[PDB]
Amino acid sequence: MKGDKKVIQHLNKILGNELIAINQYFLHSRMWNDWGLKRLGAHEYHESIDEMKHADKLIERILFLEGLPNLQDLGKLLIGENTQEMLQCDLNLELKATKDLREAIVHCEQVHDYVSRDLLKDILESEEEHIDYLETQLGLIQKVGLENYLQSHMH
Amino acid sequence: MKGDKKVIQHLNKILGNELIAINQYFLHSRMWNDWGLKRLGAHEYHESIDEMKHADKLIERILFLEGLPNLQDLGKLLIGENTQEMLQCDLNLELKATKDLREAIVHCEQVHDYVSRDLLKDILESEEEHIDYLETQLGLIQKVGLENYLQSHMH
Amino acid sequence: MKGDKKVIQHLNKILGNELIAINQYFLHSRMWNDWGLKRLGAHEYHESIDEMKHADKLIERILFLEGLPNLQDLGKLLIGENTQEMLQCDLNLELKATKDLREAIVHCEQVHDYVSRDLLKDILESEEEHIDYLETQLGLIQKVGLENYLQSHMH
Amino acid sequence: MKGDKKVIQHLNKILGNELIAINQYFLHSRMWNDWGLKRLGAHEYHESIDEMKHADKLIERILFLEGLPNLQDLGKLLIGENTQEMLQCDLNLELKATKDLREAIVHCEQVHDYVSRDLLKDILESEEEHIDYLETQLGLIQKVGLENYLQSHMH
Amino acid sequence: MKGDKKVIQHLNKILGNELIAINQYFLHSRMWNDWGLKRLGAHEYHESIDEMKHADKLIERILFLEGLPNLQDLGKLLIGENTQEMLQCDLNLELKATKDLREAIVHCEQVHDYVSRDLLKDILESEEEHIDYLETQLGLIQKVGLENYLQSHMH
Amino acid sequence: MKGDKKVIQHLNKILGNELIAINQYFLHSRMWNDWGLKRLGAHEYHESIDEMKHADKLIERILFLEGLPNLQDLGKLLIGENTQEMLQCDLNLELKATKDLREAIVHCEQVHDYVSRDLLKDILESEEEHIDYLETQLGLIQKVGLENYLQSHMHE
Amino acid sequence: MKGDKKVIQHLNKILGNELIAINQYFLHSRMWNDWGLKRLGAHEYHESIDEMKHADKLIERILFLEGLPNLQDLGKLLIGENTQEMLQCDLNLELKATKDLREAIVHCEQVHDYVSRDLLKDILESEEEHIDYLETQLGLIQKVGLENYLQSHMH
Ligand code: HEM
Numbered sequence A, B, C, D, E, G: 001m002k003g004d005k006k007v008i009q010h011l012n013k014i015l016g017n018e019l020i021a022i023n024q025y026f027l028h029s030r031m032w033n034d035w036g037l038k039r040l041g042a043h044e045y046h047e048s049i050d051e052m053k054h055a056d057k058l059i060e061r062i063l064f065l066e067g068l069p070n071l072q073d074l075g076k077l078l079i080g081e082n083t084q085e086m087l088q089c090d091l092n093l094e095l096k097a098t099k100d101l102r103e104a105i106v107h108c109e110q111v112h113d114y115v116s117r118d119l120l121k122d123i124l125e126s127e128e129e130h131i132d133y134l135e136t137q138l139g140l141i142q143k144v145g146l147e148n149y150l151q152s153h154m155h
Numbered sequence F: 001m002k003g004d005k006k007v008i009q010h011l012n013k014i015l016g017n018e019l020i021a022i023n024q025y026f027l028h029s030r031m032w033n034d035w036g037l038k039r040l041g042a043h044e045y046h047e048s049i050d051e052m053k054h055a056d057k058l059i060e061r062i063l064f065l066e067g068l069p070n071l072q073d074l075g076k077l078l079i080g081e082n083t084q085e086m087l088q089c090d091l092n093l094e095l096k097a098t099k100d101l102r103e104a105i106v107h108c109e110q111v112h113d114y115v116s117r118d119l120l121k122d123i124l125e126s127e128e129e130h131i132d133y134l135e136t137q138l139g140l141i142q143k144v145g146l147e148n149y150l151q152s153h154m155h156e
């Protein structure tokens, strides 16, 4: 079904954000596992898988709309060097992602692509839940202390 | 455990090949599904998942060896425009991948990194199975005709 | 609950499109069954049932909003006389239907009937899935040839 | 139990034919599998297995009759270079095999070795069933065309 | 996939050894069964089947590498005339087989055919387990006496 | 089946390292259990059992190759006096062990004893897994603090 | 709990005996398996495991009593060169072990370490059962002859 060109460009930009997130969260996951912080590693792994699922749906929608999904361009990964930095890197990435989602939804609404809007809204709900998780973890580090926070994520 | 620097470089090169394959096979899968060739779409999806699993193990090994896994650089995806071209693109990528795996195995053997060799050997077995599949599909197109071949991959 | 008069007119227009679709798809289903193309017959039957379910929800919404559902004024059926034409007739009907759904959603949004909008968005998602199916079937006929396409839908 | 010398010689000739057939059918099976024609590969594998079972019974009978089973001498394998030729090569081998079985049964009857006759009759029934299968496949190639026939044996 | 010509020669030489062993072990098995030494017969039957499985994998690999598997040439069977001789004939064949396997592995390693090497290493592990079995049986005959050794293999 | 004399010497050297590890890890396990650090005690017990299983496979291989497995000579146990030292002693032992395993594989390959090489590669994989565990534990002590690290290994 | 210095010395002497026995029985076990006397190998394996469990309890008791368990000093293994010698070597070791156990119990009794006495008594019961087994096997060799005795321990 012939999609609006600018909708497809928005979907490719959201996809590009998801492709960064997949790799950033997967590396953070495996770093935490290597450091023995296996509960963080497992949670971050599921965050990476969630972004893979979103990327799949975006690719499928782009192709239905007769666009070309862009899996070739990969933007800058934000890789931290300790647990606090890694969480902040994820949060910075997620805040960019939700800003971009809001702009894409505006445009879908304007051209009456209500099904693309509904998909992006579902993705936005997932990303806001990730922001909630990340903000909460950074808050917990302040409340229980970094050593206890890390201890609680060993097993 | 402090790994050999050139082993880590080889492992990052193999990882780079897997990251290309993940995206190339995932997009090819979703194109085939979009076109109604769901048996090809499903099989290509499982190829992409297998490359994801290989990339996971490579990332884990690099970190254990105290290297930095490179998930930032993404090489050229080879995307075809019809089924025959897509299969040939996959095959061309796999032949590059198995060349690079053989050079990495040589270097692991020379520095006595036998565990990394064993991992790469397992990955090479998977990639040669993929080559078998691909060559066979291209041969079947010649034996049964393209229309029959595509028909056989609809459902 | 007293609904907006023009919303109710839009809902009756969407209902009228669904009523056309029920009959068009049911007849196409039974034609395909009579011709021995039972997989097309079964799939087209399920498309008719899904339109019956949408019509039900639309009737229920109109009555809630204190309007009169119009089941009397049946528009023009697009009945094909061979498989490719029947698929194209369904596609043409669906493209008219999604155009009408988008205009109805615009009006629901403008008068703040957000529950009617959500119902229509759900119907639109189903209709775009039907468009995806239909475009894919027409593309398959081009890729595998008509004789093979029909063969694959006998059983 | 001391058997008739010429019976044992007949049994060793039949065994020689079965030994050719085991290897010919096994190679043809693995060629078809390599070419992606897995239904042919599997069926031909089961034909090879059946000849292995016949060879076992012949070896066992020869030994009971105080003869020496000849597993050293292997006659000429008839290997085809495409599906049609491979089937005709199997059929040519089978027609020689059933001629030899008949001449062996005649001799068993003449010297009153009715148990060896019964064994050979059972093998002959199996080989005639194989002839039926082969003649029928060659007929189907003519009726449905080679491309369809091979297509029907991919999966 | 275009294999190394000399790898294919090595694989065909190992296949030739396995084809000798299939027939030698199958005949020894059926001799032992005929003599009422059914535990030896069963064990030797399973040795024969294991060689059949190795031959299958070798044939499959050769075909994948675009070579011709040689099932026509059959080398000399070493058939014993009593239990001790049959075990020593099996051991003599196995010692030749493992020498040939080591030479094939050297060459696969030198041309970087690491998957062929892995297959041959697995077969070598199986052949060395058979050598352990055989050496052990010959040692048991010395320790418990031939009459007891045979008694222990009747049922 | 007559093995290469130097392969057998290498296999006996690997066996000797495993025999040290069996006893070192068993003692460390029972020390940690006596101190109430039962999660460390249990993990270290499983490390000792794993070395026992490797030793078994090496003994079996040496005998098949018609050598004499040396279970008489026991090298120096590296016994720590606190949790950090015990972990480092295990790590020092494993690093010597993997060095010796690599040299043994080189020689197996040279004389074409590919089955002995495969066995040693499998043991090497287990030993590198143990090194990963040990390095990670030592790093966790620095990230969470010793008191938290020990607390986290009190209970099974 | 602070133990008697001489009790701990006794426990360490008993521990030393158990450490010899672990290794002597494990080696004898694996020798019997290599020779194909698998029932002897299995039984001797279980004797070795039993000594491992005794050593564990002694280690635990020594640590509870605030002593240092000596796992460093390993006494002389008594390795036999045939089945009779191996059994007699085991028996010789066991007779030394039970003498040492009796002297240790005497001393535990004199200083009122009744729990250590109970542990040693349990170990002594196990070692006397092993003596029973060993004396009985040596007697069976005389009664049934070595060849039959070894035959009975093949499977
Ligand atoms: C274009 C980028 C990618 C896409 C669209 C994608 C998509 C997917 C999807 C749809 C799944 C299945 C999730 C489920 O339903 O359970 C999956 C699984 C997985 N992915 Fe990805 N993926 C991508 C990249 C990656 C990368 C770069 C890695 C690793 C470095 C990775 C590692 C994995 C793993 C380990 C699994 C689970 C496989 C299993 O064990 O079942 N993926 N991916």
Ligand code: HEM
Pocket: D019, D022, D023, D026, D049, D052, D053, D055, D056, D059, E019, E022, E023, E026, E049, E052, E053, E055, E056, E071
């Ligand atoms: C090229 C030579 C041969 C090859 C590649 C071959 C291969 C095989 C294979 C793959 C199997 C199935 C094993 C399993 O998965 O359980 C098998 C079974 C068997 N083979 Fe062979 N074989 C060969 C020659 C022979 C010969 C010469 C004989 C007897 C004279 C024989 C007798 C048997 C028997 C009796 C079975 C078991 C069939 C059953 O009851 O399931 N094979 N063979």
Ligand code: HEM
Pocket: F019, F022, F023, F026, F049, F052, F053, F055, F056, F059, G019, G022, G023, G026, G049, G052, G053, G055, G056, G071
């Ligand atoms: C300090 C010396 C040793 C101690 C304290 C010790 C202790 C133990 C214990 C407590 C068990 C568990 C038994 C059970 O409850 O099932 C065990 C198992 C075992 N041990 Fe040892 N052991 C020692 C030395 C050895 C040696 C030298 C070997 C071999 C060369 C060995 C081989 C084994 C094996 C194969 C098992 C069975 C593991 C399994 O499959 O679960 N042990 N040992």
Ligand SMILES: O=C1NC(=O)c2c(NCCCc3ccc(O)cc3O)cccc21
Pocket: A027, A031, A077, A078, A079, A080, A081, A082, B067, B068, B069, B070, B071, B072, B073
């Ligand atoms: O693709 C990328 N792979 C990377 O590693 C990476 C970056 N590494 C930052 C160092 C993080 C780190 C890794 C392992 C470890 O043990 C400690 C650490 O601090 C930065 C940007 C992009 C990438």
Ligand SMILES: O=C1NC(=O)c2c(NCCCc3ccc(O)cc3O)cccc21
Pocket: A067, A068, A069, A070, A071, A072, A073, B027, B031, B077, B078, B079, B080, B081, B082
């Ligand atoms: O990342 C990338 N996304 C892409 O689409 C792509 C490329 N497209 C080539 C056209 C493929 C195609 C897609 C859908 C369809 O319906 C028909 C088609 O021929 C080439 C290089 C890299 C990329």
Ligand SMILES: O=C1NC(=O)c2c(NCCCc3ccc(O)cc3O)cccc21
Pocket: D027, D031, D077, D078, D079, D080, D081, D082, E067, E068, E069, E070, E071, E072, E073
């Ligand atoms: O023992 C034998 N092994 C063989 O391959 C063979 C023969 N091969 C003829 C070529 C068959 C063939 C194989 C693979 C392929 O991909 C295409 C092909 O046409 C002829 C006589 C005897 C033997």
Ligand SMILES: O=C1NC(=O)c2c(NCCCc3ccc(O)cc3O)cccc21
Pocket: D068, D069, D070, D071, D072, D073, E027, E031, E077, E078, E079, E080, E081, E082
């Ligand atoms: O293919 C072959 N079939 C054979 O029998 C054979 C050979 N026979 C040696 C005699 C073995 C034997 C069988 C039965 C028996 O009761 C006593 C025996 O000593 C030698 C080389 C090759 C072959």
Ligand SMILES: O=C1NC(=O)c2c(NCCCc3ccc(O)cc3O)cccc21
Pocket: F027, F031, F077, F078, F079, F080, F081, F082, G067, G068, G069, G070, G071, G072, G073
């Ligand atoms: O074979 C050996 N048995 C031993 O105990 C031992 C060594 N002990 C060092 C002290 C360890 C220790 C144990 C219990 C405790 O409560 C505190 C501790 O610091 C050193 C070398 C060899 C051996």
Ligand SMILES: O=C1NC(=O)c2c(NCCCc3ccc(O)cc3O)cccc21
Pocket: F067, F068, F069, F070, F071, F072, F073, G027, G031, G077, G078, G079, G080, G081, G082
């Ligand atoms: O630690 C030790 N390992 C040993 O092998 C060993 C001794 N071996 C004496 C010979 C045993 C033997 C093994 C295998 C075989 O087939 C025949 C045999 O007679 C003596 C003292 C200490 C040790």
Ligand SMILES: [Fe+2]
Pocket: E148, E151, G148, G151
């Ligand atoms: Fe007897």
